[PDB]
Short mmCIF file of all heavy atoms in Angstrom, two decimals:
data_model
loop_
_atom_site.label_atom_id
_atom_site.label_comp_id
_atom_site.label_asym_id
_atom_site.label_seq_id
_atom_site.Cartn_x
_atom_site.Cartn_y
_atom_site.Cartn_z
N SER A 347 0.87 -1.18 0.00
CA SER A 347 0.00 0.00 0.00
C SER A 347 0.91 1.23 0.00
O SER A 347 1.31 1.72 1.06
CB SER A 347 -0.94 0.00 1.19
OG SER A 347 -0.22 0.00 2.41
N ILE A 348 1.22 1.72 -1.20
CA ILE A 348 2.09 2.89 -1.37
C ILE A 348 1.35 3.88 -2.26
O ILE A 348 1.58 3.91 -3.48
CB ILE A 348 3.46 2.51 -1.96
CG1 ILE A 348 4.10 1.33 -1.22
CG2 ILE A 348 4.41 3.70 -1.90
CD1 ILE A 348 3.96 -0.02 -1.93
N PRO A 349 0.45 4.69 -1.72
CA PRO A 349 -0.26 5.67 -2.56
C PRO A 349 0.51 6.97 -2.66
O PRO A 349 1.04 7.47 -1.65
CB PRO A 349 -1.60 5.87 -1.81
CG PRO A 349 -1.55 4.94 -0.60
CD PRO A 349 -0.10 4.66 -0.36
N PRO A 350 0.61 7.55 -3.86
CA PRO A 350 1.19 8.89 -3.97
C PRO A 350 0.25 9.94 -3.41
O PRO A 350 -0.77 10.27 -4.04
CB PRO A 350 1.41 9.06 -5.48
CG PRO A 350 1.28 7.68 -6.06
CD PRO A 350 0.32 6.96 -5.17
N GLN A 351 0.58 10.47 -2.24
CA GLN A 351 -0.32 11.36 -1.51
C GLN A 351 0.54 12.20 -0.58
O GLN A 351 1.73 11.95 -0.41
CB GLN A 351 -1.39 10.55 -0.76
CG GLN A 351 -2.67 11.30 -0.39
CD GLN A 351 -3.36 11.90 -1.60
OE1 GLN A 351 -3.35 13.12 -1.80
NE2 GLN A 351 -3.97 11.05 -2.42
N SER A 352 -0.08 13.24 -0.01
CA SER A 352 0.61 14.08 0.98
C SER A 352 0.98 13.27 2.22
O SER A 352 2.09 13.42 2.75
CB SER A 352 -0.26 15.28 1.35
OG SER A 352 -0.79 15.90 0.19
N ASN A 353 0.06 12.42 2.68
CA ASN A 353 0.22 11.51 3.81
C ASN A 353 0.62 12.24 5.09
O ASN A 353 -0.24 12.78 5.80
CB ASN A 353 1.24 10.41 3.49
N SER A 354 1.93 12.24 5.38
CA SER A 354 2.54 12.92 6.53
C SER A 354 1.94 12.43 7.86
O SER A 354 1.27 13.16 8.58
CB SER A 354 2.42 14.45 6.40
N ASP A 355 2.20 11.15 8.15
CA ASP A 355 1.70 10.54 9.37
C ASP A 355 2.41 11.12 10.59
O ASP A 355 3.50 11.68 10.50
CB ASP A 355 1.90 9.02 9.32
N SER A 356 1.74 10.97 11.75
CA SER A 356 2.14 11.52 13.05
C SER A 356 2.22 13.04 12.90
O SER A 356 1.15 13.66 12.77
CB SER A 356 3.41 10.83 13.56
N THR A 357 3.41 13.65 12.91
CA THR A 357 3.65 15.09 12.73
C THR A 357 2.88 15.91 13.77
O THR A 357 1.94 16.66 13.46
CB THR A 357 3.31 15.54 11.30
N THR A 358 3.30 15.74 15.02
CA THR A 358 2.64 16.37 16.16
C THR A 358 2.87 17.88 16.15
O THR A 358 3.72 18.41 15.42
CB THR A 358 3.14 15.77 17.47
N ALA A 359 2.05 18.57 16.96
CA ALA A 359 2.02 20.02 17.18
C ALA A 359 1.65 20.83 15.94
O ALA A 359 1.65 20.32 14.82
CB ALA A 359 3.36 20.52 17.76
N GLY A 360 1.32 22.09 16.15
CA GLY A 360 0.89 22.96 15.06
C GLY A 360 0.01 24.07 15.59
O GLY A 360 -0.16 24.25 16.79
N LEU A 361 -0.54 24.83 14.65
CA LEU A 361 -1.41 25.95 15.00
C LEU A 361 -2.45 26.20 13.90
O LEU A 361 -2.24 27.07 13.05
CB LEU A 361 -0.59 27.22 15.24
N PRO A 362 -3.56 25.46 13.90
CA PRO A 362 -4.61 25.67 12.88
C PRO A 362 -5.63 26.74 13.27
O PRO A 362 -6.76 26.47 13.68
CB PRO A 362 -5.25 24.29 12.76
CG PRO A 362 -5.04 23.65 14.11
CD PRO A 362 -3.91 24.36 14.82
N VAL A 363 -5.22 28.00 13.14
CA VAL A 363 -6.06 29.14 13.47
C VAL A 363 -6.08 30.11 12.30
O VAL A 363 -5.03 30.39 11.69
CB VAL A 363 -5.59 29.85 14.76
CG1 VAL A 363 -6.13 29.12 15.99
CG2 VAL A 363 -4.08 29.92 14.81
N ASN A 364 -7.26 30.62 11.97
CA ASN A 364 -7.44 31.59 10.91
C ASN A 364 -7.91 32.91 11.50
O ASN A 364 -8.65 32.94 12.49
CB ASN A 364 -8.46 31.09 9.87
CG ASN A 364 -7.93 29.94 9.04
OD1 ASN A 364 -6.92 29.33 9.38
ND2 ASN A 364 -8.62 29.64 7.93
N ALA A 365 -7.48 34.01 10.88
CA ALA A 365 -7.82 35.35 11.34
C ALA A 365 -8.45 36.13 10.21
O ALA A 365 -8.16 35.89 9.04
CB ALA A 365 -6.60 36.09 11.87
N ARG A 366 -9.34 37.06 10.57
CA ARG A 366 -10.12 37.77 9.57
C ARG A 366 -9.39 39.05 9.19
O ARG A 366 -9.09 39.89 10.06
CB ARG A 366 -11.50 38.08 10.13
CG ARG A 366 -12.57 38.02 9.08
CD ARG A 366 -13.92 37.87 9.74
NE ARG A 366 -14.90 37.31 8.81
CZ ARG A 366 -14.89 36.05 8.38
NH1 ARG A 366 -14.06 35.15 8.87
NH2 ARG A 366 -15.77 35.68 7.45
N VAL A 367 -9.10 39.22 7.91
CA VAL A 367 -8.23 40.28 7.41
C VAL A 367 -8.98 41.05 6.34
O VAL A 367 -9.47 40.44 5.39
CB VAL A 367 -6.91 39.73 6.84
CG1 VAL A 367 -6.15 40.81 6.10
CG2 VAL A 367 -6.06 39.13 7.95
N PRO A 368 -9.11 42.37 6.45
CA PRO A 368 -9.79 43.15 5.40
C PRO A 368 -8.95 43.28 4.14
O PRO A 368 -7.95 44.01 4.11
CB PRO A 368 -10.03 44.51 6.07
CG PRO A 368 -8.99 44.60 7.14
CD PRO A 368 -8.75 43.20 7.62
N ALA A 369 -9.36 42.58 3.08
CA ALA A 369 -8.69 42.66 1.79
C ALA A 369 -9.73 42.41 0.70
O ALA A 369 -10.69 41.67 0.92
CB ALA A 369 -7.55 41.65 1.68
N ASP A 370 -9.51 43.02 -0.46
CA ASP A 370 -10.48 42.95 -1.55
C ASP A 370 -10.15 41.81 -2.50
O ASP A 370 -9.00 41.64 -2.91
CB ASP A 370 -10.53 44.27 -2.31
CG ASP A 370 -9.18 44.94 -2.41
OD1 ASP A 370 -8.18 44.37 -1.91
OD2 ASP A 370 -9.10 46.05 -2.99
N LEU A 371 -11.17 41.03 -2.84
CA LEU A 371 -11.04 39.85 -3.68
C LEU A 371 -11.92 40.01 -4.91
O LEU A 371 -13.07 40.45 -4.78
CB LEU A 371 -11.42 38.57 -2.93
CG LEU A 371 -10.49 37.96 -1.88
CD1 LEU A 371 -10.56 38.68 -0.54
CD2 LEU A 371 -10.83 36.50 -1.70
N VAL A 372 -11.40 39.66 -6.08
CA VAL A 372 -12.13 39.78 -7.33
C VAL A 372 -12.16 38.41 -8.01
O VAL A 372 -11.38 37.52 -7.69
CB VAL A 372 -11.53 40.84 -8.27
CG1 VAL A 372 -11.49 42.20 -7.60
CG2 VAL A 372 -10.14 40.43 -8.72
N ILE A 373 -13.08 38.27 -8.96
CA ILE A 373 -13.19 37.07 -9.79
C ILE A 373 -12.76 37.43 -11.20
O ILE A 373 -13.35 38.32 -11.83
CB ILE A 373 -14.61 36.49 -9.80
CG1 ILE A 373 -15.01 35.99 -8.41
CG2 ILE A 373 -14.73 35.40 -10.86
CD1 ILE A 373 -16.24 35.10 -8.40
N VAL A 374 -11.73 36.75 -11.70
CA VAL A 374 -11.33 36.82 -13.10
C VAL A 374 -11.39 35.41 -13.69
O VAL A 374 -10.90 34.45 -13.08
CB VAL A 374 -9.94 37.48 -13.27
CG1 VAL A 374 -9.98 38.89 -12.75
CG2 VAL A 374 -8.88 36.77 -12.46
N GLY A 375 -12.05 35.28 -14.84
CA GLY A 375 -12.26 33.99 -15.47
C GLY A 375 -13.06 33.03 -14.61
O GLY A 375 -14.27 33.18 -14.43
N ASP A 376 -12.37 32.02 -14.07
CA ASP A 376 -12.95 31.09 -13.11
C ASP A 376 -12.25 31.20 -11.76
O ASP A 376 -12.85 30.87 -10.73
CB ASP A 376 -12.87 29.66 -13.66
CG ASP A 376 -13.49 28.62 -12.74
OD1 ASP A 376 -12.82 28.17 -11.79
OD2 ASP A 376 -14.65 28.23 -12.99
N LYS A 377 -11.02 31.69 -11.73
CA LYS A 377 -10.19 31.71 -10.54
C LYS A 377 -10.51 32.92 -9.68
O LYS A 377 -10.93 33.97 -10.19
CB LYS A 377 -8.70 31.72 -10.92
CG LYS A 377 -8.27 30.50 -11.72
CD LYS A 377 -6.76 30.38 -11.78
CE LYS A 377 -6.34 29.13 -12.55
NZ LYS A 377 -4.86 28.97 -12.60
N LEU A 378 -10.31 32.78 -8.37
CA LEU A 378 -10.51 33.85 -7.41
C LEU A 378 -9.14 34.35 -6.96
O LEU A 378 -8.42 33.64 -6.25
CB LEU A 378 -11.33 33.36 -6.22
CG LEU A 378 -11.60 34.37 -5.10
CD1 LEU A 378 -12.69 35.33 -5.50
CD2 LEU A 378 -11.97 33.63 -3.83
N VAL A 379 -8.79 35.57 -7.36
CA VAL A 379 -7.45 36.11 -7.13
C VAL A 379 -7.53 37.27 -6.14
O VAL A 379 -8.58 37.90 -5.99
CB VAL A 379 -6.79 36.55 -8.45
CG1 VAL A 379 -6.90 35.44 -9.48
CG2 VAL A 379 -7.41 37.83 -9.00
N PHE A 380 -6.43 37.50 -5.43
CA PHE A 380 -6.30 38.70 -4.63
C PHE A 380 -5.95 39.88 -5.52
O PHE A 380 -5.22 39.74 -6.51
CB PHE A 380 -5.21 38.52 -3.56
CG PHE A 380 -5.73 38.05 -2.23
CD1 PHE A 380 -6.06 36.72 -2.03
CD2 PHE A 380 -5.88 38.94 -1.18
CE1 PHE A 380 -6.53 36.28 -0.80
CE2 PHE A 380 -6.35 38.51 0.05
CZ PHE A 380 -6.68 37.18 0.24
N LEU A 381 -6.46 41.05 -5.18
CA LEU A 381 -6.16 42.28 -5.90
C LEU A 381 -5.54 43.26 -4.91
O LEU A 381 -6.24 43.99 -4.21
CB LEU A 381 -7.41 42.85 -6.56
CG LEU A 381 -7.18 43.85 -7.70
CD1 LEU A 381 -8.16 43.62 -8.82
CD2 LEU A 381 -7.30 45.27 -7.19
N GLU A 382 -4.21 43.27 -4.86
CA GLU A 382 -3.45 44.11 -3.94
C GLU A 382 -2.64 45.12 -4.73
O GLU A 382 -1.94 44.76 -5.67
CB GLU A 382 -2.53 43.25 -3.06
CG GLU A 382 -2.25 43.78 -1.64
CD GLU A 382 -3.50 44.03 -0.78
OE1 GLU A 382 -4.57 43.42 -1.03
OE2 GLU A 382 -3.38 44.79 0.20
N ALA A 383 -2.73 46.39 -4.33
CA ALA A 383 -1.96 47.48 -4.93
C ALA A 383 -1.23 48.24 -3.84
O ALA A 383 -1.35 49.45 -3.69
CB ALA A 383 -2.85 48.42 -5.73
N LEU A 384 -0.47 47.49 -3.04
CA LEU A 384 0.13 47.97 -1.80
C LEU A 384 1.18 49.06 -2.06
O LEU A 384 2.30 48.79 -2.50
CB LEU A 384 0.71 46.78 -1.01
CG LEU A 384 1.82 45.78 -1.41
CD1 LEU A 384 2.08 44.84 -0.25
CD2 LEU A 384 1.55 44.94 -2.67
N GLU A 385 0.77 50.30 -1.81
CA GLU A 385 1.59 51.49 -2.01
C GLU A 385 1.46 52.39 -0.78
O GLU A 385 2.37 53.14 -0.44
CB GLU A 385 1.19 52.19 -3.31
CG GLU A 385 1.60 53.65 -3.47
CD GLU A 385 3.07 53.81 -3.81
OE1 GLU A 385 3.72 52.81 -4.18
OE2 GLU A 385 3.59 54.94 -3.69
N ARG A 386 0.32 52.28 -0.09
CA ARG A 386 0.12 53.02 1.15
C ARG A 386 0.67 52.27 2.36
O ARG A 386 1.22 52.90 3.27
CB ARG A 386 -1.37 53.31 1.35
CG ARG A 386 -1.98 54.16 0.25
CD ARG A 386 -1.73 55.64 0.50
NE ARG A 386 -2.01 56.02 1.88
CZ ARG A 386 -3.21 56.28 2.37
NH1 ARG A 386 -4.29 56.24 1.60
NH2 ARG A 386 -3.34 56.60 3.65
N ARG A 387 0.51 50.95 2.40
CA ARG A 387 1.02 50.17 3.53
C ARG A 387 2.54 50.09 3.51
O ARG A 387 3.19 50.31 4.54
CB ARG A 387 0.41 48.77 3.50
CG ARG A 387 -1.08 48.73 3.79
CD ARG A 387 -1.60 47.30 3.75
NE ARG A 387 -3.03 47.23 4.03
CZ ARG A 387 -3.76 46.13 3.88
NH1 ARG A 387 -3.23 45.00 3.45
NH2 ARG A 387 -5.06 46.17 4.16
N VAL A 388 3.12 49.78 2.35
CA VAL A 388 4.55 49.69 2.15
C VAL A 388 4.89 50.67 1.03
O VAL A 388 4.04 50.95 0.18
CB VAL A 388 4.98 48.23 1.83
CG1 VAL A 388 4.23 47.71 0.64
CG2 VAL A 388 6.48 48.06 1.64
N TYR A 389 6.12 51.22 1.07
CA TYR A 389 6.69 52.22 0.15
C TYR A 389 6.08 53.60 0.32
O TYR A 389 6.19 54.43 -0.60
CB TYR A 389 6.60 51.83 -1.33
CG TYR A 389 7.09 50.46 -1.69
CD1 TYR A 389 6.21 49.41 -1.87
CD2 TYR A 389 8.45 50.22 -1.88
CE1 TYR A 389 6.65 48.15 -2.22
CE2 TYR A 389 8.90 48.96 -2.22
CZ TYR A 389 8.00 47.94 -2.39
OH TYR A 389 8.44 46.69 -2.74
#
């Protein structure tokens, strides 16, 4: 039983937490892409 897969058995500890971030998202074609024009935050 050797399936090509991510698998990664055991692998203790981690941090599965998500945080809510204000950012604008657009739809182009079928894919959902981020639209960032970062000029005020950086530079």
Side-chain angles (χ1 to χ4, degrees), residues 347-352 359-360 362-389:
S347 60
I348 311 100
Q351 202 56 253
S352 313
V363 278
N364 290 14
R366 215 161 202 71
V367 169
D370 35 2
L371 285 80
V372 302
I373 295 194
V374 299
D376 182 277
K377 299 194 178 181
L378 178 78
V379 311
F380 266 78
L381 199 140
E382 211 56 24
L384 61 177
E385 161 76 14
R386 299 276 314 278
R387 292 180 180 170
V388 56
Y389 309 100

